Structures are given as C-alpha cells and as structure tokens.
Subunit: 270 residues, 3 copies
C-alpha cells in the first residue's frame, strides 16, 4: 500500500527522437524503469514539453479511463501541458465467488498513444516507451536490471549495430526486461543463458512444467522478463544476444552481454 | 457425457461471403458457437447448400478420419449434399502406464478445409469459421461469451476494417474467444484488462506460475480464450481492444469493450 | 552423467546443400539427432571438410565461449580444420540463494553460425542444422523420434515444398522435434492429435494448467517437442500435419503422419 509520486517529461531529443525522462533535459530511450510492489499506487505528474500532443499508456496495471492515455478517453496532453496519471496495482487473492484474482505482478511497459496516429505509431517509433516492473511479495531481487526493446528494426532506437552492451560479473543476478514494438515479429535469443517461459522467468521449483528456452517469438507490444545468474555453468565471456530472424541479425540487431570474471577480466573477443 | 445432435448449413452470403448457420437463411460470420462438456459427443448433420464442395474441420476435438473434413480422407461434401460429422471429447485421466492423458477442454474452432484450395483458403477468407468451447467439470461459467476472429486484415470479416463492439456491465464475468486465420501474425491487446496465459485464461490459484498478460502474439489457426470480470479494479468505460501491430491498429483493427455502470451509463462516451 | 564422444563432419552435398554427418560421406539434413541425459558431457570432434569456415552452435546446453561457434569468440573452424566442441548439461537443483536452477532438459538444436554470414544465414539455408534432445531422469522414452524443421519455405530442405511422411502404429508413443529457421514465422498444426505447451509436451498430472493445443506459432530458432500416443481416441489413418499459414500450406508445406491399425492397414488406403 505504498503511495508514490514521480515527475515524468516527454521531450524531443537533440537527434530527432523523442523520449521520456524523470527531469528536464534528461530524457532517455528507453525511458526510466518504474518499479512497484503489488498494492502500490503511483501518481505520475506528466509534463509534455513538446510541440505536439503526447500521452502515457501503460500495460498490465490498473488505471481508470481518465489515465488511459488515449484520445478516445480524453486523456492525452496538449503541447506544454501537464497531467497527472494514476496507476494502481493489486495483490492476488480469492474473490467472493471462490475464483482466484490474478495480481498485477509482471514485466510491463508504458508508451505513447497519440503521437503521429491515435495509436501512437509515431511516438513509439521515435522512442516514447519504457519498462515497468511490478513485484510480488517475496520475489527475488536482482543485482542489476537491463531493458532491451526491439522497436521495428532497431534496438533501443540505437543507430545500428543497434544493440547496446550490458556488463556484469560472473554470479551476478541480472534481470532483463524485453519489450517489442512496431510492425515486425522478432525472436529474442541469448547465448550461454536460458530462462523459464513463465511470469518471472525462473522455475518455482521441481514441479513447475514451464518450458525452459533460450529463444522466444515476440510481437508488437509483447513484454516479458527473466533473471539469470550471469555465466552460470558457462563462465565469463562476451555472450551475444540477438534477434534470430536471419535478416535482422545480419543487419546488426545484435548486442553483447559482457560477463567478467571477479578480477574484472573477460576472455578476449571480436 | 451426453450425445448431442445438431444441424449445420454452409451458405453463400451477400458479398462473395460464405457462412455457417444453425438454420437455412441464418448463416453468420463467425459461425455459431458450439459449446460442449468433456465426455460429450456431437453429431453434426451438415448440409452444403452452396454450388462448390465444402467441409467442416475441427481443431482439438477427437474425430476419426471420416470426419477430418478433407479431400484426403474423402470427408468433404458435394454441392447440395449432406454428411454427418462426429466430434468426441474426453476428460483427462491417468493411462494404465501411469502417464496423464490430457483432456479435450479448451478454446477451439472449426473451419472449412476444401473451398478455394485443399486447405480451405478461400472458405476461410470468405467466412467459413466458428468457435468451439469444451468445458471441464467445475470450470467457471461466464455471463456472456464473445468471439473475435482476426481473419487476414478483417475482424469477423467486417468491412471498413472496424471491429465489433461488445457490451457488459461492471462486474459481469465475460468470456472472449480469440481465433486467428489467414496469412498474417497479429497481436491481441485489451485496455484495462489482463488474463493468464494458460488453458482457461484464469489462474488456478496461488501455485499457478503462468504469465499474466494483456497482449498476445497469434498466428493463423491459433485460438485461445479467457474470462475477465468487466471493469474489475479499473471501472466502467469504453475499453479498446485492438491488434497492436502498428499498421493494423492504424488501419482500424480496433473495437470497444463497453463496460457500463449498473445504472446503464459510461464515462464521457 | 557419462562423458560421451562423437565425431561430426560438415560436408557439401549435392545441389548447393551442406550437411552434418557422423561419418564422412554420410551427411544428412537434418543432421544427426544427438540425445543426452541431464548431467552428461559431450565432446564433439568436429571436422570441417568444406572450402568455407564452418562452426557448430548449440541452443540450451552449457558451453564455454570456446565452444560458442562464433567469429566473435574465434571458435569456428577453418576449411579442412578440426576442433573439439564440448557441450555440458546439468540437472536442476536448489541454489544457495534459495532459487531453483533449471536443468538442461528439453528440445534443442544446433546449427552453423559462420557460413555465408556471421550468423550462419547461408549455412542454415543450405542444411547445416540438427536436433538435440536432453532428457531428465525418469522422462518417458518414445518408441520413435521424428524431426521436422521448417527452414524458410522448405521442410527439412526437401524439394517441391513437401514434407516427409512418418509411420506409426496405433498406440505407439511417438516423439516429434519441431525446429524453425530462416526468415518467416510459421504455425505448426497436426490433425488428430494435440499436446501440452510445456517442456515435454505432456501434462504431468491434473495440477498442470498448461494450454493443450494443436497449433503453435513458431519463429526462427524456436524449438519444441512433444510426444503423442498415435491415433489415441481417433484411430488409424493418414493424419496431416502442416503449417497453417494459408499460403504456406497451399504451396505444399505439408506431410502425413501415417498411423496404421495393429493389423498393418490404413483406413482409406
Ligand atoms: Cu491501445
Ligand atoms: Cu528481429
Ligand atoms: Cu501498448
Ligand atoms: Cu489441415
Ligand atoms: Cu494485426
Ligand atoms: Cu485449422
Ligand atoms: Cu547467435
Ligand atoms: Cu509456414
Ligand atoms: Cu541459433
Ligand atoms: O495501446
Ligand atoms: O487444417
């Protein structure tokens, strides 16, 4: 039941892109990671510093239509405007009727829904997306969290080779949040590492029958996440991740998960 | 379970379309919802009223090759002809070697397999598809059931790329059956509602580790379903569903889930 | 687990193809099925008989960067050269942080990662792929295992877009390994049969909420498998499998699971 507040700004970036940021002139693509525990409420004091209408739409979380971020529900923001979005989460529980209500926990995301078209096509293309993680009580917390967004044919709207590199040390618990946008399907593959196809990316125990995978088909606005122990059973190294759609990897939709030894070294690569 | 008998008709409809119906003259796209409990048998006395060969093929359910609905197994229907298809369902249970045999329960579908091509490509495109729900003993029943078919670049073969709207009252248990056909992948998204990625779309309880989602990638002939409590924790309103592939949403592959207050109104709509 | 050793060769085949084989002159597409139990180590003495650099990259299994099969990690093989790749597997268990380490068990695959491009595009296109199955202790073993690879618009690089046929007898426990490669998404559908969407393709018991399906969207480098009891509740027959993307099935991406009665015959020929 923690009630939190944050300021968020939409800004046009020096290069032509658009981005969310927690302060003026600090916008990033992807936007800031929002982390909540189930039961939390978040008030987002959103300011649109751009010269076109902009909004904030979230997946997964509970919001009233007045925080939908659409034109249909009159919840976008005029240029230079300001608006307070409210997102809520709940824990799972038993309803009166005896059914189980699923809680909010998961790997989610937020994006623009009015820039360019009513569905936010132009905003999303330009970089108005970011990750949201909602944790369940008792969920295991990572040493670091990284966000990878396959947006059309770019990763994190990077120039290309589109992928960023992420660094860790052997044994670190690392979380990846993976979001996809745009027009195309992709397949996310990471060398050396695997995860479970379930809510957390990790098996609950010997009795969880979830497929264990290292490759997953994803389409626009899919989101999933997982945690790995960096280098577990495989060692230090430059571990690539990439889209496995052969034309995509060949165009350089690839990056590196650099797993260093505890002395800071890595077996030579490239 | 029970042995059930129904009649089904395939008919041309007025725009190059084709549909299945429970009565002559009442063909619809999507076809009629067939709904069964595990164990039941269904005999469908199928009549093809069109001037081309047609069939009925179902996913998921038990059928012998004589009800495959294919030219391969000579189970399609000449123009103006009739054929009785039989679908069977079974409950889950343990085999004599201790392995677990999965039951028929799920969100399935049926479609033509011989119109236009030997894979029913023209029949599907023209509207010859419908939903089938097989329920397990003890499954929670909804108040209303709605079918959304992404068929190539149409929803339920409606023109103007628009999708249908559906109406509920806050708190109604509402079931959606989502089927995809044709050539393209899509991603199904619903504002303000979420479901579990498992058989019923609902978590069994605290031990079920399935991902809770509000967006799912789907391809031709995929089907899944879910139930939601309309407006739960978000309230009344015009809640959009749409394909999230950006050019599909832009082109209007969108509809509304209109969730009313008990007093019949909806926010700013 | 045991330490096992094999030799593997990459070779040019007729018609601009390339394949892996266990012996010189005996390359196949798909390559040989490699089967391991969790805990086993495999040393593959790999010999590149081609005039281009080639490698072996595996999904799912444990390997160090020295056996990555990539240019990045300098672990591919010069023309005429040899290299030992080592693949390891582990059983699941509880870590010291209290979390459960998933084992290596599953349906995996291997393929080239340096022919034509640095992601093996050319090699994969030409036929340098194969299946790997890692079993968990106590996993039920099948009577037969069949591998279907959807590679771009071919099945197992066979001509005329046809897929192979597979034969079984009613009641046989038959395993399928399904791998996808290339540029396209596909949807795998099998008539008459269904499976669970989970690690083994089978439900573990009444507590498993996995969707039971007969159609699954797959993309490049996805792999899954399942076992079915051939003809269970449906009988003998010619049971089609196909991609359900309509233009794919219409182009011939289809094959038959031929299920015989115990007396040897198939219903309808
Ligand atoms: Cu939307
Ligand atoms: Cu891609
Ligand atoms: Cu979205
Ligand atoms: Cu078929
Ligand atoms: Cu779509
Ligand atoms: Cu079908
Ligand atoms: Cu790779
Ligand atoms: Cu296909
Ligand atoms: Cu691969
Ligand atoms: O959205
Ligand atoms: O089919």
């Amino acid at each position: 039941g923690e009630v939190r507040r944050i300021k968020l700004y939409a800004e046009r970036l020096a290069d032509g892109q658009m981005g969310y940021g927690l302060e003026k002139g600090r916008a990033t693509i992807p936007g800031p990671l929002i982390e909540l525990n189930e039961g939390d409420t978040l008030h987002i004091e959103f300011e649109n510093t751009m010269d076109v209408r902009a909004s904030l739409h979230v997946h997964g979380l509970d919001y009233e239509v007045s925080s939908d971020g659409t034109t249909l529900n009159k919840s976008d923001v005029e240029p230079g405007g300001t608006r307070t979005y409210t997102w809520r989460t709940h824990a799972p529980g038993r309803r009166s009727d005896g059914t189980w209500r699923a809680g909010s926990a998961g790997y989610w995301h937020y994006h623009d829904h009015v820039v360019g078209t009513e569905h936010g096509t132009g905003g999303i293309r330009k970089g108005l997306y970011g990750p949201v993680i909602v944790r369940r009580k008792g969920d295991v917390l990572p040493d670091a969290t990284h966000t990878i967004v396959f947006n059309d044919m770019l990763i994190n709207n990077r120039p290309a080779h589109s992928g960023p590199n992420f660094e860790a040390t052997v044994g670190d618990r690392v979380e990846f949040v993976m979001i996809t946008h745009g027009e195309y399907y992709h397949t996310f593959h990471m060398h050396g590492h695997r995860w479970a196809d379930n809510r957390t990316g990790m098996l609950t125990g010997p009795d969880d029958p979830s497929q264990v995978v290292d490759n997953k088909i994803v389409g626009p606005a899919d989101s999933f996440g997982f945690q790995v122990i960096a280098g577990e059973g495989v060692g230090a190294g430059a571990w690539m991740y990439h889209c496995h759609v052969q034309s995509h990897s060949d165009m350089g939709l690839v990056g590196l998960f650099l797993v260093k030894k505890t002395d800071g070294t890595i077996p030579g690569y490239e």
